Design a protein around this ligand. Structure first.
Ligand SMILES: C[S@+](CC[C@H](N)C(=O)[O-])C[C@H]1O[C@@H](n2cnc3c(N)ncnc32)[C@H](O)[C@@H]1O
Ligand SMILES: C[S@@+](CC[C@H](N)C(=O)[O-])C[C@H]1O[C@@H](n2cnc3c(N)ncnc32)[C@H](O)[C@@H]1O
Ligand code: SF4
Lengths: 363, 14, 25, 417, 123, 50, 405, 105
């Protein structure tokens, strides 16, 4: 129900956020050039996966700024790297003492006009962070331009920088390239991160909570109530099943669901679950089910494990000798650390200034 | 039709 | 405290020890 | 040309106008559709090669006014049904221009009582303009309704009706009625369908007579009452331009016409009006009341009905009362008729076996579509009497400044942009 | 058009021993006045049968419908030929001339929920 | 609860008219505490910079 | 010199537009209030001064209105027509086909007075900020343009059967046909009970029929099953003038499903809540309700919000019901965002002795507490900026140099 | 070869669709200089366990002798709501890059 979803999000919100960050960190470092233009969530109860994916692949599109000094913000992506360089130039300006002599003028050479246009665009992107609301410009008392009231020509205007191939080093040059920001902005425009994202959630209460969670930060998310077997026809760049396989009902065919998820993946399908015996068995069965696809089809499409498994054979921890007697030597999990929230701190009789989230994941 | 049932008795002008 | 999830359990596995409800309390 | 059938959905009245006085919120002014030639004969007096008749139009106007006003009591109820129509005429002569309607809840919080006061010329002769551009041998007459100062006006009639605005009870109105029409159709063979000569019955033409002569019985030459079997034939109605019909049912006007007709016949037998043995003396109604008790089944037209009357009491303290319904005139003698009509077969039963309940299903009752009373006056003594009692006749700068101020602001600002 | 195609599909059904069939006439083009054909068929069938047993109206432009619910064998044979006579005569009068006509039926010896008589005219 | 006073500074006034119940006070505080303290940008340096 | 033209579809050729409803009443309820009177007085003051006589150029006077649901521009067009030169409208329909009406409004009036965005109403607060609009208007439900369209699936009696994808805009996922083909019986019953129209036994019966007669190829078969479960759908299709309780289970089920696959409950709840935040002080919000659950939700939200107070409610005129065929239950709720606490005014009428006693008990037991010490809670504050935070805003403009760390 | 399909639809509607298809087929093939010499039709029984029927319809023709619309061969079915803006199809060059008319009318 909706109250059950509220409680689930409050108690397991931070832990799931931590796990998704711990997974996306390794994903970003391992596949630095990946950028999920299109995303799918299988069972996005509260949209924590969407929030983390937005934070990693587009940290400059959020309502609020991220914490810069945190290790979680240093991602290996291309878009994250672009934003990191943009933010780092500020700290470099801080490191050096410059003249900072602005040139304030009034009505009465053209470089002043163009730099003023650039500063106006900078202010436009500044107000989005400050007010935590895009389109905040229109609500001002300022006059509206008569050019694009419906914005149709802006959306239907052909870009002159995107061109097909036919249609037409040295440290100093590298330093100049990195100093020039226009190329960085053009690269960001070429890389539309998470432009279209669909989230699947049959539970009405969880869907209701996730819509609210995601509306402020990730715009234009398509919410599906069910994952149809006919929906294989569309593949997404990123497909995440975060803490869902374990909660799929036993009456439904988990193998069919997982095969559909893989066959509708244009990319880096990510399974995440809480470290448990049942969850680990589910994740290992899924590992085997997808790895069964190695001997069929085009080679350039077969599944590969990018993390955590370096081998594609059976899990030596799942087939260990000690694990038969010892329950500790059975799970190939990993650990996430977070600052426990007051809900968890109250639900436990301990202060727990640092909460622990064990997760098993498969990319 | 009901109007066709009344037309045998007589016609009406609406 | 636990029975309030009875209204959330789906109809199928709702009366598992008795495959019917007419004869149910 | 004729419209002898008229769906109940349409009415004879145009949009009503609520009065702006705070204490006259219940008061509305009604303007009737004279323009339509369809309602023209029903909303205007008939002309004889004048008849003074009013029940043809007074009842219609009152009933349709209440039908229009039904919405404020319907509350979304499935069906709306009118009844208890009382009329009292203060001046038999003269036509009607408009009416004032005051509506209240009556007694029950589930009905809507109305009070109609009719205002218009008290003399139709003045407005009459005979033979205007006759052309063909039969001229077409026209009336000047709204006249500046050439016409003297005053209250002509006062009426009151009430609608119940209730639901559709399946039992009393669907499958008992279903059985009653079938029983009447089966009984159709019992009667002899011979009409009566209208000369001794008050009508001019044989096309507007619905009263079977072989089944008209009188007690002591009509001195104790009378009975008559009649049929409102669709054939009679179609080629008669006064009255219309519904899909199946017969309106109150075409039900009360038969009452007026049998009253004229019984008056001839009782020596109350001069027979034809020349001009015809058709007694006219001054004040009449008509009610429909539950279940409020309508009068089926195509099946016969038996009307029954009381002995005429000739008035030289009325038995009914001083309120609306009794005559509001004094002078020449009047004739009082209590009437009740039965439409159904109460004597048909089908006793298949004692074990079952034959009476709860195949039993039925000859319903009373319309009951009530009428007061009539001889056509020759219309001008002898005068109304008794007296009733009275029911007869922006700041906004402009604000709007002009607004326009000042708008046109002043238009320049700056 | 200089060539027109007319499709007359007769759907035969029967339930609880009462056999009915519905003819549907459709023209290829729009310029034809089909209210006139409906008029002509009404005039020619009011004499042959009561309207309680058949009904013909216009479903839309250039398409007409004609049902018969309870009709004897001989009477149905009358109705079919009369409707076809009027169709061909009306179309030819409009300024056309019949070139070819050909029909087909569903063999369906086993019981079939619908039988279809597809008649095709070229004008 | 009188609107003027704080939530913990329970008021000593006994009147009824200019008061709102404590459930209403709680709802108002929940609807009112919906803003984030601004995040210092210059105070802390970037992880990549460090 | 050839022209390229995209062939029109049957829907494009035969589309019809939603008729206007409560034009004068909506105008009185939306261009009316303290904000409206102050705007008019500002126009007076400016006209008086005019008779007397790089930076962001501001408007001297303007009245801003948001249309969370612009279908046909009739309501969005009324505020611009019957208004004056000092009016502006921003429309946020969820359907991309409403730009057809938006284009007409832009062509008629100025492009500086109209704006359009293809988004759901719940995201208005995300696409704007608090205290941004003087007026807001919400007209949920379906537009007549979508009812007759064979592609939208709202079309009834549909001789032949269509795809029953009766949903608003692409922002939703699965349509009604596949929703009924995939959903579970318990899920359908629980989802239907959220709107009240369909009592538990009726919901159980209808969901049982659906689950037993799945799968559904198209609308004609879905409707056959719905016909068997319950009574025949009433005449007049979706718009039935009969009472809510006496309307057939088939009609109630269709309406409930149409709401279910559009999340109308959540959409309207968040629209009202977000409007009460993004409206200006003593601004005006109008919302149209046509179903009992909508009326109930509006009443409860206005009675519980600690700034909203219901100004008045207006029913639909029977003349409009007759001419345009609207449901006779359609009413208009005009709400106003009190600048101060509205509870001082609401307790004038809603305060019982039991409520007083439970309030005293709550104060004694300290139930009205919240959270201020805790990781996320310690970072939150009221709307007005703090002294310690004005410093953060003034300081994150230029950082100092540092040698060590 | 070409293809045409319909869904479950009233018998009169299906007859209209097929009659229109055949009328246009004859008109199109006659536009090429061919006059319809002969034709015929055949309807087969329905499949044993299914209501599927097969109708084989043949024509034989003997030889007798500006705005273009963009239309994809394989159409795109249209679910209720549009998934892209109304103007998404059109591409328009940059306003600055636009140039002046060389022709008139
Ligand atoms: C409880 S978690 C929700 C939160 C989400 N895992 C996260 O981390 O943000 C798993 C979700 O999967 C959904 N789910 C369960 N079975 C499903 C199925 N068969 N198909 C699609 N979703 C399902 C449930 O609604 C549930 O909310
Ligand atoms: C009843 S029509 C409004 C017609 C027009 N505004 C009028 O009153 O004349 C409602 C419109 O709002 C749109 N709509 C429904 N829900 C919406 C939502 N949650 N957000 C934005 N638009 C919505 C629908 O697409 C529909 O066209
Ligand atoms: S989960 Fe651990 S033990 Fe198992 S295959 Fe992967 S890396 Fe090896």
């Amino acid at each position: 129900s909706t109250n059950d979803a509220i409680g689930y999000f409050l108690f397991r919100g931070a832990a799931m956020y931590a796990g998704m960050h711990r997974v996306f960190f390794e994903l970003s470092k391992q596949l630095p050039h990946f950028v999920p233009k299109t995303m799918l969530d299988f069972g996005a109860g509260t949209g924590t996966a969407i929030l983390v994916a937005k934070e990693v692949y587009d940290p400059g599109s959020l309502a609020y700024p991220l914490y810069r000094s945190l290790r979680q913000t240093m991602q290996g992506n291309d878009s994250s790297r672009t934003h990191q360089l943009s933010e780092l130039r500020y700290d470099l300006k801080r490191l050096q003492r410059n003249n900072e002599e602005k040139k304030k003028v009034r009505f009465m050479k053209r470089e002043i006009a163009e730099v003023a246009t650039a500063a106006a665009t900078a202010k436009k992107d500044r107000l989005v962070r400050e007010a935590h609301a895009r389109y905040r410009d229109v609500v001002d008392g300022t006059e509206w331009e008569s050019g694009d009231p419906l914005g149709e020509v802006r959306a239907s205007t052909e870009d002159p920088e995107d061109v097909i191939d036919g249609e037409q080093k040295t440290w100093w040059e590298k330093l100049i390239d990195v100093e020039n920001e226009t190329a960085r902005t053009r690269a960001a425009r070429r890389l539309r991160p998470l432009q279209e994202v669909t989230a699947v959630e049959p539970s009405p209460g969880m869907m209701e909570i996730g819509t609210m969670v995601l509306h402020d930060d990730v715009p234009n998310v398509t919410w599906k109530r069910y994952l149809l077997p006919e929906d294989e026809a569309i593949q997404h760049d990123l497909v995440v099943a975060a803490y869902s396989l374990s909660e799929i009902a036993t009456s439904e065919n988990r193998r069919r669901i997982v095969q559909q998820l893989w066959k509708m993946t244009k990319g880096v399908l990510v399974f995440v679950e809480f470290a448990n015996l049942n969850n680990f068995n589910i994740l290992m069965e899924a590992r085997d089910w997808i790895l069964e696809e190695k001997d069929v089809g085009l080679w350039d499409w077969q599944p590969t494990i990018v993390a955590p498994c370096p081998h594609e054979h059976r899990c030596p921890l799942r087939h260990c000798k000690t694990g038969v007697k010892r329950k500790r030597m059975r799970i190939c999990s990993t650990e996430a650390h977070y600052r426990s929230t007051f809900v968890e701190v109250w639900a436990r009789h301990m202060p727990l200034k640092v909460g622990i989230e064990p997760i098993s994941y498969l990319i | 039709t009901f109007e066709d049932a009344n037309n045998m008795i007589a016609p009406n002008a609406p | 405290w636990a029975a309030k999830f009875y209204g959330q359990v789906t109809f199928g596995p709702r009366n598992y020890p008795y495959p019917s409800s007419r004869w149910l309390a | 040309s004729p419209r002898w059938l008229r769906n109940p959905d349409e009415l004879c009245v145009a949009a009503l106008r609520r009065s702006r006085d705070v204490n006259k919120i219940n008061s509305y002014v009604a303007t009737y559709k004279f323009d339509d030639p369809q309602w023209a004969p029903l909303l205007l007096p008939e002309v004889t090669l004048i008849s003074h008749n009013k029940m043809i139009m007074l009842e219609c106007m009152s009933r349709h006014v209440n039908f229009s006003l039904r919405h404020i009591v319907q509350k979304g109820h499935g069906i709306y049904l009118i009844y208890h129509a009382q009329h009292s005429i203060l001046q038999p002569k003269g036509l009607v221009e408009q009416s004032f309607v005051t509506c209240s809840f009556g007694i029950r919080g589930e009905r809507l009582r109305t009070d109609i006061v009719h205002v218009g010329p008290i003399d139709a002769a003045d407005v009459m303009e005979l033979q205007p551009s006759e052309g063909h041998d039969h001229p077409r007459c026209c009336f000047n309704l709204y006249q500046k100062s050439d016409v003297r006006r005053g209250v002509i009639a006062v009426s009151q009706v009430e609608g119940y605005g209730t639901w559709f009870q399946r039992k009393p109105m669907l499958w008992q009625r279903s059985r009653r029409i079938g029983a009447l159709q089966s009984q159709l063979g019992a009667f002899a369908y011979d009409l009566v000569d209208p000369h001794e019955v008050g009508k001019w033409r044989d096309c507007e007579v619905s009263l079977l002569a072989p089944h008209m019985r009188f007690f002591r030459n009509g001195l104790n009452g009378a009975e008559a079997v009649g049929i409102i034939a669709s054939s009679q109605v179609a080629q008669q331009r006064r009255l219309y019909l519904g899909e199946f049912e017969a309106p109150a006007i075409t039900a009360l016409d038969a009452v007026q007709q049998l009253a004229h016949a019984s008056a001839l037998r009782c020596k109350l009006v001069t027979p034809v043995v020349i001009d015809m003396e058709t007694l006219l109604p001054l004040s009449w009341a008509t009610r429909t008790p539950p279940p409020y089944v309508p009068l089926e037209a195509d099946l016969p009905f038996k009307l029954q009357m009381s002995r005429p009491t000739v008035f030289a303290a009325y038995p009914t009362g001083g309120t609306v319904g009794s005559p509001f005139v004094r002078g020449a003698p009047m004739m009082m008729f209590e009437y009740n009509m039965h439409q159904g077969v109460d004597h048909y039963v089908y006793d298949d076996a004692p074990s079952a309940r034959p009476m709860k299903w195949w039993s039925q009752k000859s319903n009373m579509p319309y009951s009530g009373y009428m007061y009539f006056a001889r056509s020759g003594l219309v001008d002898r009497f005068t109304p008794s009692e007296d009733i009275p006749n029911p007869l922006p700068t700041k906004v402009v400044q604000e709007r002009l101020r607004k326009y000042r602001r708008k046109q002043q600002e238009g320049h700056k942009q | 058009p200089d060539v027109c195609v007319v499709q007359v599909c007769d759907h035969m059904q029967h339930d609880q021993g009462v056999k009915r069939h519905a003819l549907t006439i459709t023209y290829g083009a729009d310029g034809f006045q089909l209210r006139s054909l409906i008029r002509r068929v009404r005039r020619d069938l009011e004499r042959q049968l009561s309207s309680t047993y058949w009904q013909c109206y216009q479903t839309n432009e250039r398409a007409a419908f004609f049902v018969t619910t309870k009709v004897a064998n001989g009477t149905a044979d009358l109705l079919t030929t009369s409707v076809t006579q009027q169709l061909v005569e009306h179309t030819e009068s409009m300024g056309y001339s019949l070139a070819s006509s050909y029909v087909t039926l569903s063999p369906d010896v086993v019981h079939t929920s619908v039988r279809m008589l597809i008649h095709n005219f070229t004008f | 609860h009188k609107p003027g006073e704080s939530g913990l500074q329970a008021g000593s006034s006994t009147t009824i008219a200019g008061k709102e119940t404590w459930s209403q006070f709680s709802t108002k505080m929940r609807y009112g505490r919906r803003r984030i303290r601004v995040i210092d940008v210059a105070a802390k340096m970037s992880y990549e910079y460090q | 010199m050839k022209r390229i033209v995209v062939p029109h579809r049957w829907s494009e050729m035969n589309r019809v537009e939603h008729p206007p409803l409560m034009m004068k009443q909506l105008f009185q309820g939306v261009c009316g209030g303290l904000r409206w009177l102050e705007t008019k007085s500002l126009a007076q003051y400016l006209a008086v001064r005019a008779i007397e006589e790089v930076t962001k150029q501001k408007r001297l006077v303007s009245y801003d209105v948001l249309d969370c649901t612009l279908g046909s521009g009739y309501h969005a067009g009324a505020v611009l027509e019957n208004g004056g030169p000092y009016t502006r409208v921003v429309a946020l329909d969820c359907d991309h086909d409403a730009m057809h009406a938006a284009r007409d409004l832009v062509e008629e009036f100025g492009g500086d007075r109209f704006r359009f965005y293809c988004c759901k109403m719940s995201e208005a607060k995300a696409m704007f900020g608090e205290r941004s609009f003087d007026a807001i208007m919400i007209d949920g439900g379906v537009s007549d343009t979508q009812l007759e369209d064979p592609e939208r699936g709202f079309l009834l009696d549909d001789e032949g059967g269509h795809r029953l994808d009766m949903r608003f805009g692409p922002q939703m996922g699965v349509g009604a046909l596949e929703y009924l083909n995939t959903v579970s019986q318990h899920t359908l019953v629980s989802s239907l009970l959220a709107y009240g129209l369909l009592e538990y036994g009726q919901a159980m019966k209808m969901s049982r029929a659906i689950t037993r007669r799945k799968p559904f190829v198209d609308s004609r078969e879905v409707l056959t099953c719905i016909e068997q479960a319950g009574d025949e759908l009433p005449e007049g299709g979706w718009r039935s003038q009969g009472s809510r309780r006496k309307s057939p289970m088939s009609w109630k089920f269709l309406t409930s499903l149409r709401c279910i696959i559009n999340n109308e409950m959540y959409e309207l709840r968040q629209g009202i809540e977000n409007a009460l935040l993004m409206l200006r002080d003593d601004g005006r919000l109008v919302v149209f309700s046509r179903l009992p659950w909508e009326e109930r939700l509006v009443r409860g939200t206005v009675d519980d919000h600690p700034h909203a107070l219901l100004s008045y409610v207006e029913d639909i005129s029977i003349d409009d019901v007759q001419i345009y065929g609207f449901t006779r239950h359609a009413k208009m709720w005009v709400i106003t965002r009190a600048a101060s606490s509205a509870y001082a005014l609401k307790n004038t009428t809603t305060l019982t002795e039991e409520k007083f006693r439970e309030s005293s008990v709550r104060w004694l037991t300290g139930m009205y507490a919240g959270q201020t010490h805790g990781f996320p809670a310690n970072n939150f504050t009221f709307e007005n900026f703090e002294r310690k935070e004005w410093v953060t805003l003034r300081r994150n403009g230029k950082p100092p140099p540092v040698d060590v760390g | 070869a070409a293809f045409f399909v319909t869904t479950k639809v009233a018998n009169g509607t299906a007859d209209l669709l097929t009659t229109s298809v055949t009328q246009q087929l004859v008109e199109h093939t006659e536009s090429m200089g061919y006059s319809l010499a002969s034709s015929y039709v055949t309807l087969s029984p329905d499949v044993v366990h299914t209501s599927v029927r097969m109708l084989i319809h043949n024509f034989t023709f003997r030889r007798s002798r500006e705005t273009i619309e963009a239309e994809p061969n394989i159409p795109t079915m249209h679910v209720g709501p549009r998934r892209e803006p109304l103007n998404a199809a059109e591409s328009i060059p940059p306003r600055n890059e636009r140039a002046v008319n060389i022709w008139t009318v």
